[PDB]
């Protein structure tokens, strides 16, 4: 257990436990201090550090000692004995608290006993020397006034208070010679400056701070863990694994970038949670190896040492004893001393990966930063941490006894104001950069709002070292976790061997280095026209001294006129933003506009599925202006063409080493020593591609999800400008008024913030996930692959490596050299999936990841898509495709393929995916219009196969032909064996659902089956489970290839790839998702158009069409004609039959050209009576359920109604429509549907029953029923003359 001594600033001192000391940095001069032992090798200075520190310094002026600090200023701090005491007594209360849980307990203990070696690199092996800085520290025992006596004492910690910066806590280490012990094994007296009242003030990005944009954000830190903090940096320096080693170092080649120190792995290990994530597994095991390498110095010593020159009354015994139990040597039975792997492998993870901020923090139930690198906010005041009413030992400001425990309130700014005070700005120094255009304009950026980008040179490149093979050779990996539950379980964790007496002779020898500090300009001025983020947020702000602002589409005038504040909302809400109105339409308007505040925020939920983009938040480049220029043009088109790259403000230069060769080393005669050579060499591969992919991780945690990251920030402080700003003109609008006319307004201020504010908050639950999604989307698409290429290479070189090894061998190793043959080519052939959980458990990131491996639009691996007038891949990946010059393409995204050797598409695909899961896994989509067969040249139809799309590589693939009415899907695996499946339709059916129509075609194929569905529906399925391994990967090539005729042509849409197998409703939504349109289509699936020939077709009476009736103006229903040749194989009725008929538009004069024929449409159904243009209509008075309609020359009746409306009433796909006939354009009074109605007719000579072209009520309410009838004779189809279908 840890005893925690308690005493008064002005006990007696005692020479004891209350001394006066000489701290290591007055070099054995000036004046001493007194300090107070809290525990045993503990000390507490109540006193300002000021070693290395100007007098003047402690004054706030236009300097800062640290870029990015907000940092405070108080050069009264501890200037009293009562300030001093109050510091000793909250120091006593910290240490208390941390001692209240066994984890904390455990930090102090192993720091208590981990005492430093006595001695350092200079001392030889067979010596103990306690004359040295990081060992001893003298105290003064003589009276005041007199250095004449003075003794030396063994110390581990010096906590002292705050340098110039009260909230800049600093651990710090002693060096002598260039050397620091502390970082070489041996360990020495460590020291800190700590301020606990003033804490720093953090807010987390993906959550809200009580979700109050009007209230203060943010959540105050526990000075208990910002103290343990640095208790870890102690605990490092005393067991002298504070090592150093390749640092992660921020890239400050462009103005946007930030910058900061240089940042070592022995930070972020101290920090925890994600941050390890960033040091490269390679890096995390060069430092390993150092600190090992550190400690085997250690043990030589312990077995070399034999006196102790400084100090006669050392007992060498006792401190070899201490030693071994602090570094976990073990003893043999003569006192040998020597390392235990598994023992140092322990002690290395508990000190590193188990005593950490975040892991402290989750036992602690302390909310804290979610990394190291996020903004840093203005620090507060505690009140008063000696009041049990704000903090506690047991709970710290999270008291549960006032319901401040849940969701860490009593942490929270918003809710706990009462704990802590806000500090005068007037004392704030901030390193800022100044941006000014060259004119003359400047704005003032915080340092910590630019982005960080870690520099090319922050990442090891160990990588690219050739290894050597030996059966003795292991794979290496350092895990960066460490069980925390079982560290507090540990029964020989914490020692219980003798800590030996403090005092010892007194120092003599005062070398040492100090460092010294000095401010540097809190200003850079730069210069750079670019309007890029700080710009955009900047136009959205206005001056302190203007009220009177109007909001503005225009950056530029933003800019240039103070009373202007740019919005990237619409054009209308920016017009009713600025609507001046009388007091008595005042509370109308606020209501309207705090509405179209919340409306605009929503649109951040947009999704854009026909692109395959579930979410977009289509204004971000309009309020930010971040990466390439996504202000301009239009954002959702923009990302559609490049994705989540258009955003980045720099596109990282990626480190990905070629990976060094493999050194087979033989053994001749020895069947086991090659056989394990060769073991080790594919086992030591695999640590080289997951090695590989940590390096990934690294950079991309660190030069990408960081801008990523001050996006979002950028984003959330966008919609609060925008808030704050109609805030302001809200009041302003409501102060113009007379107090008669307010006291009758109706307004209610803190409804119209809590609105504000809530829309805000969905707002930016849409943007994170969005933004998350865009940065794993860099990662998958445009990193892994990169690795992937470099791996697959690898591999390779490898491969031949160990066959020819083999070979080599093949005398030694007899009848195996063939099974391990194998055993290389096998296991080189399954490569190692990426998982992030296996770099990081970091529950955000994963979530993330995981999210994105459940969306099904993230397996597409091919996406061929029109953009201006070409054909491009926009799946991400990157494939190279030629479209040649025979392709005809059109911006509805139809291509077509025709019998010319030039008509032709080239894919090359990226050889970097996984797509070769070992199984077969991956499906494929599209759209295709098939033209319908020649009357006389059936034979050749039927018979003739063609393929349209092929993809081999190798003689193995898959491939797409056409027979006739058959379409094929073939796979061939790597042996040559072939499995086919099918669908073929009917030609034989009066009216065809599939010839020269439009339909949606979609093939999946898994280990067992390959199934074919169309238009949603499963259609076929082979049995596939003989097929072997499928080359799948090779270039795609779409070609009309076969014995064609040269009338041959095929048209397709919407061509895909997903990398997995698609479900039936993966199927059915993208099938609907594909289908919709605002516009109506033809017959043939086409869009509908005004101006243009059609047959009518009528879904209700497929073989039946309207002609004008010889002798009365109605239209008579007869049956189509039908094919009339011979052949057996086929039969359809007539489509181009009855009266031509052609749309023509109601609204707009813009005379009578071409247009697209949208759902809701008014419209004029006429139709071609010989060289005249006539019209349908309805008789208005009729009274009856129906009546025949009147055909007729175009003219105005009063008699007769001539507007119709195209309706389009089914929900699900379909190219049928309806046509309804209404009142007027504003009423609501349905005449009825336009159908088909059955007479009966009985005359002088004949007797029958007739149909006829009719407008009927009863279809009104038909047409509601679920699901849709097909089958109801108001539902029509247009159909125009078309080269693919001959009669
Ligand atoms: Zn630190």
Redesign the pocket.
Known sequence: PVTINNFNYNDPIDNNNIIMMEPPFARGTGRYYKAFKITDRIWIIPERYTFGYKPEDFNKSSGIFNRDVCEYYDPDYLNTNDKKNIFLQTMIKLFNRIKSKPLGEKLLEMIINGIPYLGDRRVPLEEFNTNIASVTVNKLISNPGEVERKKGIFANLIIFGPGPVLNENETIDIGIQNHFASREGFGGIMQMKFCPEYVSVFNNVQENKGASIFNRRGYFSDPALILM?ELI?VLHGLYGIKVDDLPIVPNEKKFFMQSTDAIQAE?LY?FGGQDPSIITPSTDKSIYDKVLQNFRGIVDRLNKVLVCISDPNININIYKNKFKDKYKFVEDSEGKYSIDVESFDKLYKSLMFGFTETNIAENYKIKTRASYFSDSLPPVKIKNLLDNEIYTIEEGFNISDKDMEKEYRGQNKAINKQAYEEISKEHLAVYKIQMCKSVGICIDVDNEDLFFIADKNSFSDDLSKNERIEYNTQSNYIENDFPINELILDTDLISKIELPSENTESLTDFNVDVPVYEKQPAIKKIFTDENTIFQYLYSQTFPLDIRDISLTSSFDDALLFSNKVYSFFSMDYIKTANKVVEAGLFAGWVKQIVNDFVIEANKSNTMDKIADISLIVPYIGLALNVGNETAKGNFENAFEIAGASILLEFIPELLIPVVGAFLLESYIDNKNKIIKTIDNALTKRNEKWSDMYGLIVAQWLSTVNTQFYTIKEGMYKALNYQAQALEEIIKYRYNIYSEKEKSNINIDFNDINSKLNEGINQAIDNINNFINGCSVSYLMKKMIPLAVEKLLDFDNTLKKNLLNYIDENKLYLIGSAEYEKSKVNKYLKTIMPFDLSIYTNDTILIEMFNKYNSEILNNIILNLRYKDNNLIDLSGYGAKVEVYDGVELNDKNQFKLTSSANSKIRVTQNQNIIFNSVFLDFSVSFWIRIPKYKNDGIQNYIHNEYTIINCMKNNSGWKISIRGNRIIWTLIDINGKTKSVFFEYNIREDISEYINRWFFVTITNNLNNAKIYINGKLESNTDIKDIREVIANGEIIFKLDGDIDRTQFIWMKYFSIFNTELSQSNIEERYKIQSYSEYLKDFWGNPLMYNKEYYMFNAGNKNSYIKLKKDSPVGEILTRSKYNQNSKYINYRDLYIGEKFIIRRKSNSQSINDDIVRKEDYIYLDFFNLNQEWRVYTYKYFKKEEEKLFLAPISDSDEFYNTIQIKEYDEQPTYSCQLLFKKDEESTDEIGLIGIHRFYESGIVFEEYKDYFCISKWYLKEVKRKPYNLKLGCNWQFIPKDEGWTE
Do not use: F, R
């Open positions: 903090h940096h930070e101290t």
